[PDB]
Design a binder for this molecule. Structure first.
Ligand SMILES: O=C(O)C[C@H](NC(=O)[C@@H]1CCCN(S(=O)(=O)c2cc3c(c(O)c2O)C(=O)c2ccccc2C3=O)C1)C(=O)O
Ligand SMILES: O=C(O)C[C@H](NC(=O)[C@@H]1CCCN(S(=O)(=O)c2cc3c(c(O)c2O)C(=O)c2ccccc2C3=O)C1)C(=O)O
Ligand SMILES: O=P(O)(O)OC[C@H]1O[C@](O)(COP(=O)(O)O)[C@@H](O)[C@@H]1O
Ligand SMILES: O=P(O)(O)OC[C@H]1O[C@](O)(COP(=O)(O)O)[C@@H](O)[C@@H]1O
Ligand SMILES: O=P(O)(O)OC[C@H]1O[C@](O)(COP(=O)(O)O)[C@@H](O)[C@@H]1O
Ligand SMILES: O=P(O)(O)OC[C@H]1O[C@](O)(COP(=O)(O)O)[C@@H](O)[C@@H]1O
Ligand SMILES: O=C([O-])C(=O)[O-]
Ligand SMILES: O=C([O-])C(=O)[O-]
Ligand SMILES: O=C([O-])C(=O)[O-]
Ligand SMILES: O=C([O-])C(=O)[O-]
Ligand SMILES: [K+]
Ligand SMILES: [K+]
Ligand SMILES: [K+]
Ligand SMILES: [K+]
Ligand SMILES: [Mg+2]
Ligand SMILES: [Mg+2]
Ligand SMILES: [Mg+2]
Ligand SMILES: [Mg+2]
Lengths: 419, 436, 425, 424
């Protein structure tokens, strides 16, 4: 069987490793998002279209380099390349725009960061990767600089030094997610300890149900060479096996000679690594560690993920306004793809931060009766699923909806047979 | 502590001290035993059904009303004794006592009627007396048949044939009473609705010191198959003459419930003993204590690992509903069911939450007592013009009855299990509702 | 051979879950191992004759309980003499001799706060007559155990004190009582009157689990085979109660009226023996050993470190037995706490230790009577050979079996530190 | 007692966790490694690492096995490299605290059958007393039988580590492992023969199967590749070394990093530093439980004693397991259970001392004293030699507990005793 299913049925982690097979082909869609840094090698609209097709989900703008005019042109080219595929709504792929700050240098929040954060809000960025976060008040300062119009922007705190690692719990508590920024971390702490910080932060983010990004030098040699080293493919695979929600490309896409090939390589590795995850242990541990809850979205999410594993569901289709119901399903790491149907273009972009969430932006005319409108969004999730290869006739899907309009009311799970 | 800290702040430390919840959160079975507490009071309604044999000591309508109030769920008629006229009178008295509570539909308790056959004796097949007794059962509308000395699958096919076309709905519980029945258990279970571990004859047919092995094996296999299993005979034997049982008898009842039995039975204790009502009360009190002492964490994990993957939406919905109920400490799972099957599939996962089964079928309401933790509510209202409105009314009946009976309080979370179209076999929906 | 793997519930033993272990239990899978749960029989008019006592020792009685709630000191001194005469009648065959402990069960405190004056006199009688164990009635707190220990005086330091938990206070103060006691008795008779009868199983399971965690003996007592006081065969609930006490983890099971005053004393001992043997094979060792290991704290005591290594080695090779040399019984007790499937054959020169180790599940005491060899290593080896020859005569061992041998580096108690894998020749 | 400081080091809070997820959450960059580095480092000897002075620095940095790649150079060139390795190793014989055996491994050029060049290179290996052969492109069991036959009448004690470098070797892995002494995951060729994105699956599978079989497994190629020209490795390279150790590799290897790069000693130091951190991060609670469950029951006393000794070592946090071995087999059977305690192997065989570097956590001590007339006295002198070397090296202190593994009679194959000793 395909997708490492013989290894998935093993009774121990050791026997699971023994049953991994190079001939067992991945079938599921790639779950881990790829963040590509936009720079001179990846700015053109033509190049960006190839990167979107290769698998890029989030475009990162590094505000340590370039100018506001330079980054505004990069953003416009990304949006032009993304919108060139809007003519086919059943296959359109949203792409998030993330702003990576310069940081505080030797100083609180720098004056350049205040200006760059204002630029981000004015240009409608979806995410901020806040550099050198060392305490909870650093996150509050970034949040205040985003102003009242930036309330919806996700703040991903970059842990880059000893203090950020030691104050991790307080930083995670007030952040939307974390970035393990291994470049600076490997200079701030002994290089041989970075893997411990990475594994600990990934484990704690998985426990909290918050996104974690593994970043820097994942495919470094691909800046000048067409193929990566054996250590680089292993590093990407191990970040996915560790539990990372996203993987990142920096120089490989910003300035390298093979930007599209680097995206394709991360895509190919992530797909193979996701099938090699030992879900039997992972799901059991995530389920046991997740606290008891009286929030109906939290209760519906665990019931839906348990139902999906019971029937080998091809997908969990969820309606979401903010992305929260999809995120609560994602935290249990289902093998079934989480297809998130939303009308919010921003939520569709932001939900790429959560592993295994495939956003579908709903642009069909509204139905007069709310129950009919919900049913047509579910049929849209199914038709997009069929066109993209997620679903076939005869598959079982789990459908997650709410009892009334508006965010916060998810409380229903349904088992549906396709066609 | 982090996995229960926010819910402990919300529900309070008193909530988490009751119903053996500190033992329930233990990481190993050994730690679970160490945390069992005689001061941790049971809160949940008693989920293991009590089968009481009706005889001279428990035949009067007034006595039967006391037995229904004490906890009797199934009335057993032993066709090894008495006559058809005698058993017909016992059935009529049971129905009169049961119907005396029908005036309040929100609190009415259905009681099943089970016929226990005499058996084949030295003969190889279905005896002539069994054919007549089975015909009597169909004519008197019995809900269940406890078939004596089942030794192979063809014995149950013979009982099924003798029930005729009008007895298709009657549940057949095969009694395993000898070495052959134990050895051919898998084939017998496959064609039966459930099993009875008939320890009286089993303890004479096989060495007495081996009966506990047969009991534990059959209970484990029935739990794995999701089929009811009854533990029977000499559970509270000394209560035939004494008002209080021995230490071995209370332990035996508690251990049958901990083994996984769906029902426990009283024979001479209710049929001829001096303390029939007290015997029912004692089984009720022990079963409530033992149900709270079940280590659900291991049981649910093992039922998931052992159960094969399923593409039946009723089965997929049932595991999702039970998982959701454990996540929020749901007070109940309300399920709409025509035949009892959706309630049975929830029951096989052994939820701690009560399974309140709302049905229009009076027979299904009586028969679901065979499944652990299923509380039947008989809905008597005529159908609404719009099917979705009729579904909603039945769910509200379950909620309002749940509040009236003490199962539910304002602020509780309940899991609601329904289907997408009318008729049996279409359960596919799970909803989380907050009680207001 | 394939026959080996069909016996002693070995298909159920290899199951991956407790549920599948239950599903694989087989009434045709015969027990092979020797019965490991000790039987305590209460002495009375039905079991006091020397000839009847010989039959009870052959049926499996390991501990004789003297109930000091009945009879004078003169009655109990005769009971002691008769027990010793019956036990010593088998001393002429040292390879088959079975030690039998004598336990004194006190009358209790009554309406008083703690140690009654009658208990002080009974305890002094126990020391003067050399009893091995005291079952202290109605223990409610740690100071009750200290009072029993003080009443035993300086000459009774070696006597084991088993605290009987018989009321709500003893259950609530269980941890402090267990800490100062050598073991516990779940006295279900009084417990079932002091607390609601439907809660006794919770107290029994909790106390057995905590004693197993602590590595201290626990006795399940009262009305286990009650109907056998007058009837030749027990009820279905009684056989199930005995089997479930063994499956719960009890080290000993007890008979009271069944052996003291009933008409079937020998048959009651035989019935407990037959049930315990079937129940011990049905224990799911895979989960039990895993949980005992995880719960047991780290240790720097070499006896404890050797014991866990020896039990792990025994499971790896399906050892027929673990033979241990012991002066006080402590090395055998530390092996027993890990619940090996292999029998723990304890070879000792101490007649008292040989009697007292019956409190520990799976310990088979052998009393070595030969004078010491001049070379200490030769004395150790002769004792190990005595364990092997006793084991072969009694059916524990055959040629070709593997056995784990546990010894120490110097004479005297407290120095066990060696484990060795030995092939039986 | 041990103190609270003891329980804060070597990731002991993460070691006590009840789940793998909790274990990851408790990993701490401030919890310092204390145990000696247990994963062996294989360094390829070439132009950048051939001189006696350079080899002395590589031995001090942590090199345990010297690899000679017969795909390059000549017999004369490799004979000079072997002589320089032996000269550098023997320069530390004057101090027990610095002397360390170093194995010599011959890596063949590769292949219808065994090539003429491989036959001659294998003969060169036997004549020069190599300890190990890394056999290139092993595709089936008969390839290993051909290498074994070419090792001739004198080289039957040489360990054959089969290099799995293509699709066929991966598919016929079980039959190859059965007849080999160990495996090398040769990722360079493997990443060209199969899709590059599948190499991690083959690596994890082969490591898991070798751990299950109790046979050494080497992770090789491009582990610290950028260190050929740069003084510090990339983030992906440090992670790759740490993950090979966490996967269960017995050895890690350096190729161009030591053979031709500008920083050979620094590459060895980097592998040493990462392996030490990664070994403390292994979740022993699950690993030991799974190795125990997957391993079949055994009636071999060495195997039964090994599991009892490893269980005893975990129970008391033993500083070391001292084992007397002539062939290395008793040390290998302890190593397969992955104890946290160091396995100090006392042997009179210089070849067994070099070869046990293939087994994770085995620290060989070569013993050269003349045999005592009373065998029990000869055994006691070797046990005390292991203890005094352990005290001198920092493994042991007075008051520590050690597990000692011996047999009941002389000769290899009789290990059946485990003892708990308090260090005095
Ligand atoms: O302290 C510093 O000076 C910088 C520091 N380190 C680095 O950025 C690394 C070293 C430099 C190269 N990069 S890179 O290749 O990933 C990279 C390069 C570029 C851009 C990036 O975003 C980017 O990540 C631009 O955006 C851009 C824009 C306009 C012109 C050129 C460029 C460009 O070359 C890695 C940091 O980010 O804090
Ligand atoms: O498929 C092949 O072509 C054969 C294959 N080679 C490679 O692919 C490797 C990758 C490129 C570089 N390395 S290297 O830097 O590690 C390497 C280089 C050299 C030596 C090595 O051992 C060695 O591994 C010498 O021993 C030596 C001796 C004398 C002169 C020069 C040298 C020398 O340069 C070799 C193999 O050896 O398996
Ligand atoms: O994931 P979120 O943000 O809570 O959104 C979930 C919400 O989406 C719905 O399914 C559909 O709501 P809308 O019709 O307003 O889009 C609600 O019933 C539910 O509360
Ligand atoms: O448990 P059963 O027998 O399958 O009945 C479940 C059925 O009950 C319902 O919830 C309601 O059906 P009715 O309206 O026919 O009573 C169905 O949607 C579902 O299929
Ligand atoms: O179990 P205990 O009382 O600690 O006795 C174990 C002792 O028995 C021995 O094996 C034999 O000692 P003796 O020769 O004194 O009987 C000692 O080596 C060991 O210390
Ligand atoms: O690991 P190996 O090669 O089997 O060697 C273990 C052998 O070493 C010993 O401990 C000591 O043997 P020698 O005195 O011959 O060295 C033997 O008793 C045991 O059989
Ligand atoms: O800023 C970053 O991404 C880093 O340092 O790794
Ligand atoms: O028939 C019965 O119920 C029995 O034998 O137990
Ligand atoms: O004293 C006892 O043995 C009792 O009360 O059970
Ligand atoms: O030969 C090797 O070492 C390789 O291919 O990795
Ligand atoms: K930046
Ligand atoms: K009958
Ligand atoms: K008494
Ligand atoms: K080579
Ligand atoms: Mg940085
Ligand atoms: Mg019968
Ligand atoms: Mg009493
Ligand atoms: Mg190669």
């Amino acid at each position: 069987q395909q997708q490492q299913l013989p290894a998935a049925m093993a009774d121990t982690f050791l026997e699971h490793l023994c049953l991994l097979d190079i001939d067992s082909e991945p079938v599921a869609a790639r779950s881990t998002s790829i963040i590509a840094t936009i720079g001179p090698a990846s700015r053109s609209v033509e190049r960006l279209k190839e990167m979107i097709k290769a698998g890029m989900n989030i475009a990162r703008l590094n505000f340590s380099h370039g100018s506001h005019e330079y980054h505004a042109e990069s953003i416009a080219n990304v949006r032009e390349a993304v919108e060139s595929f809007a003519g086919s709504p059943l296959s359109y792929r949203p792409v998030a725009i993330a702003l990576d700050t310069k940081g505080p240098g030797s100083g609180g929040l720098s004056e350049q960061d205040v200006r760059d954060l204002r630029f981000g809000v004015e240009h409608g960025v979806d995410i901020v990767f806040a550099s050198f976060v060392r305490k909870a008040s650093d996150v509050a300062a970034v949040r205040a600089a985003l102003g009242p119009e930036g309330h919806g922007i996700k703040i991903i705190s970059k842990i880059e030094n000893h203090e950020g690692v030691k104050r991790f719990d307080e930083i995670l508590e007030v952040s939307d997610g974390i970035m393990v920024a291994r470049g600076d971390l490997g200079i701030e702490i002994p290089a041989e300890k970075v893997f411990l910080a990475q594994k600990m932060m990934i484990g704690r983010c998985n426990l909290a149900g918050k996104p974690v990004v593994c970043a820097t030098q994942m495919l470094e040699s691909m800046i000048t060479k067409p193929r990566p080293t054996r250590a680089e493919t292993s590093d990407v695979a191990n970040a996915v096996l560790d539990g990372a929600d996203c993987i990142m490309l920096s120089g490989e896409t910003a300035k390298g000679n093979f930007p599209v090939e680097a995206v394709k390589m991360q895509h190919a590795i992530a797909r193979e690594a996701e099938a090699a995850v030992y879900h039997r242990q992972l799901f059991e541990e995530l389920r046991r560690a997740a606290p008891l809850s009286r929030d109906p979205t939290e209760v519906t999410a665990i019931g839906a993920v348990e139902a999906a594993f019971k029937c080998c569901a091809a997908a969990i289709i969820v309606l979401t306004t903010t992305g929260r119901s999809a995120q609560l399903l994602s935290r249990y790491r289902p093998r079934a793809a989480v297809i998130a149907v939303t009308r919010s273009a921003q939520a569709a972009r932001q939900v790429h931060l959560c592993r295994g969430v495939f956003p579908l932006l709903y642009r069909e005319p509204p139905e007069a009766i709310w129950a009919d409108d919900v049913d047509r969004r579910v049929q849209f999730g199914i038709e997009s699923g069929k066109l993209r290869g997620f679903l076939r006739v005869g598959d079982l899907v789990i459908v997650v909806t709410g009892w009334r309009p508006g965010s916060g009311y998810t409380n229903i799970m349904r088992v549906l047979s396709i066609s």
